[model samples]
Target: ARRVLVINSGSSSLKFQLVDPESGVAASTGIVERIGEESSPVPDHDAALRRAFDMLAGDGVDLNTAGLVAVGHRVVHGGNTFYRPTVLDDAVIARLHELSELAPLHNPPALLGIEVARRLLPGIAHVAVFDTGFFHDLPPAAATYAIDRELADRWQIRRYGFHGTSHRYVSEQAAAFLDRPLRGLKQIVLHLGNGCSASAIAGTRPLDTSMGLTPLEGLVMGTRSGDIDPSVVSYLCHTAGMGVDDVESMLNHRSGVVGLSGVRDFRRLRELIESGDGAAQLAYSVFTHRLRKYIGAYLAVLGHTDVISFTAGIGENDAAVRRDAVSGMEELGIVLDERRNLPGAKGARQISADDSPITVLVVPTNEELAIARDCVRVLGG
Candidate 1:
């Protein structure tokens, strides 16, 4: 028993999971998408969440008797204020509202979900498990920006890395898979989903991460430009006659693989490349090239990395990406076993050759499980 309900909310979608943290089993998991849309069945997050609870009930999970201990909310931005697994209260909610400016697109809907969940499940502890919590302790050298120190401090401007939940979970999973002590190992974790991020970890401590200030600062994602020159914003404003927000939205929504190839999905992009599409091939090249740069930089950052784990949509399933990301890097001790990289198997497995100096793996990330465990830990049960 002892289940926790995990909610990851978007502006118009909700992904909920009923997880048994100890067993890593999900009793029920589902997503309610298109909330608030004109044609959608669900009018708001409240109704969306109710539908999710109905799913658990349909799965024969009786709320009163199922040992549901807590409701864990996947909060994307902790800013500089809330980095811990925080128990929600009025005070905490107010602070979360203040932090909403840091993550306008993400946090607002999550707050809506939190309010709805707490109202419906009032008997249990409601915990906010932050995605940025793991990278909160990044060294000053890595977190600091080369800008005006006073202005930066006043605005809390630093590299507050996102996707910490997946990075931290995957890093630990990598250690467990290797039968090695986490504290004794240095590792690099690449979480390459629609929103991608990379982390350099020395055991449990994060030395550095790719995503900064916001999720838009790191690696090239499905739609995000990632690692763009800051002056591009102002340049677009002056030359292109675009506003700041317009340029910001363009970078976040139109400047990644999709911006280059006119396709947001890897599968579709691959299809285009197979048909001799030049733009798709270029997009693939840029995506993997950026990945190699990060891997190389993290190698320098960690000094000696024991493992490099690729997780999420692209990392776990796309064998070609897994291959090209480390292509011709044998001198760097990264030799991909193409046969091993093929995706016939399930669960965590090595993609690197047996004799390769650095272990390359594809460890599927379970962020919901991690959040549920954190809820249990924070509640002392």
Candidate 2:
């Protein structure tokens, strides 16, 4: 069976999966974790990707035996240039490198993965599937920022939404599950994971998205401080003797759940919350409150939301969070079916009342599969 290798490289980890494109099923998958740290920094992105390859091969998955057809990579920021999955070439890689400054946290590592993979798997076709591709069709108003036109044009400073892979995949799946065409359907997709984001999709196209310019915006996430006042950076720098780099680093990696609860992992936080820890309760409330704000904002953006789908780690599994998010939105046409929304109700099930004006669904996102499928199409394999 032909397999497509899907690589999603993050700053600290690399997740690789071998998928059979014909069936859209993962034949084998593995993760290389804690790639960069002081003790064993791995030091470079290429080294991390090499480690990922070794981990995948060590599993005895037999990449050569599987008849691996192509490689697909998850590139976080495509800016406004790439609107769809494109084959990776020297020119494309160069362009991606140019756009690295915009997503200092993601693009460099992703580009390194592509470069290393190309060298390792010499003749294999490689495809770059962007996370921003899904929102490429966002309305002009949604994509625009209230900034100087000259500066915006020169720097391309605008809302280039992230989490497109998850949002696009889940939105399509949600529409299919609801037996409705994605076109003409207004849906708000809440992807609540360690790195959370939300998107308002109007008929297969994103009308608005939470993350803007960078992933460290919008909803509160595991380690990212989302949606802080613009003046906070200057304020911190002047008062606390902090530098721009220091403040940026703090917001990106030291804030959010970790900063709030002194813990980054959701499972650990949930345990603390269950034990009635005050800090954990506050963290939970802050996270959910920010998410609720986004949901409400997107609902207004969509004008008429037909389906509200939740995906990713926290959204799909945390039944309590989901229930809390929709608790008081009855007037907004959203009513959660307590029975279906509860734990162990069902996987990818609707949790809305029968007569509810809006459908609430829990859809699992398959970003790897989406990338692999895009790779096959782009490579004509």
Candidate 3:
């Protein structure tokens, strides 16, 4: 059984999966949460990778004998380059380091994982799969910002979408479920996870995505504040005596669900909402409202959307979130079938009414599988 190890290193967690690339079946999957907390003491990305590899080794899976071909890493920011998966080398690592400023939250840890894994796995090939690659084909109108062209060009500051792997995989899966060719089909993919993003795929490529140059600009996430007034920072700095970097750190790490309702876990928040807790209810409403607005905006952008698909943690699993997102949108031809939208929909299935013009689907995204496939394709495996 030939295998590919896919490593997704985030700011605070490392998710690893050893899979058969051809079958897209995971032989072993493990995640190390709270990577750098002193109490838990994983300490850093390198340590997290080593722990994940140890778990894999202890799972009784033989990497060398299992025909392990390569390791694929999910690198969040590719900046203006890396439109597709690329084989990792010294130059590639250097480029990733250079682009770190653009993705301060993601690149450093991902690079650390790649570097550590290369030494640990030794002879195995390492591939860098980018989250920005899916949005590389976005149209100029969608990618451009209403700012000075010179500044934008000089700083490379424009919308470079994230969650490309999830969006791409889910959109394609939705198209298959709808029995429609992806080439010219319009679809909106709501990737509501710990970090949420919505992508409008006009055909097989992304036309627009919610996440901007940074991941913090999009939908309400587990901890990040999404879409705030620009002047809020200035207000905090001048009036509240907050530092710029501190304010940014707070927005990215202490805001969102945690800020709004004093809790980061959606499951607990949902229970609070059910118990009529004002703040939790309000937080859930705001999160859904933001998601609904994006769906409507993308619908207008796409002009003719055939599928509205949901993926990622919240999207696929949270029934309330999906219901709230599509609610009161009958005029827009959006309707969710309660039965199909519930927890037991299974794999990929349409959750919209037959009369509705658009189909609502829940497609479980497999980013690791997508990464492994990209790795094999790039390496000619």
* Cα TM-score of candidate 2: 0.93
Candidate 1 vs candidate 2: which has greater lDDT?
1
Q: List TM-score per model, in order.
A: 0.97, 0.93, 0.94
Q: Quick one: best lDDT, which candidate? A: 1
Q: Kindly list the per-residue Cα lDDT of model 1 for residues 1-381, writing each as its tens digit.
A: 688888888987898888898898888878898888999889988899889878888888888888888999888898888898999998899978988778888889888888988888888899998888998899999999999989998989999998888988898899999898999999988888988888899987999999888888868888899897799877878888998888889888888988988887788987888899998899888888898899899999999879889999888898888888888999988888878888778899988899999988999998889888888998975
Model 1 poorest ten-residue lDDT run:
228-237
Off by over 4 Å in 2: 34-58
Q: What lDDT would each prediction earn against the true structure?
A: 0.88, 0.83, 0.84
Clashing pairs in 1: none
Q: Per model, how many backbone clashes are there?
A: 0, 0, 0
Candidate 2 lDDT tens digits, 166-280: 8888888987897888786888888888888988877766788889988888988889989988999899988999999989989988899889889977888889988899999
lDDT string for model 3 (132-207, tens) is: 8888878899999999889899988889988888888887887777677889688888888889988887776777
By TM-score, the better pick of 1 and 3 is: 1
- Extract clashing residue pairs from model 3: none
For model 1, the superposed segments whose C-alpha errors exceed 4 Å read none
> Cα miss at 228, model 1 (Å)?
1.4
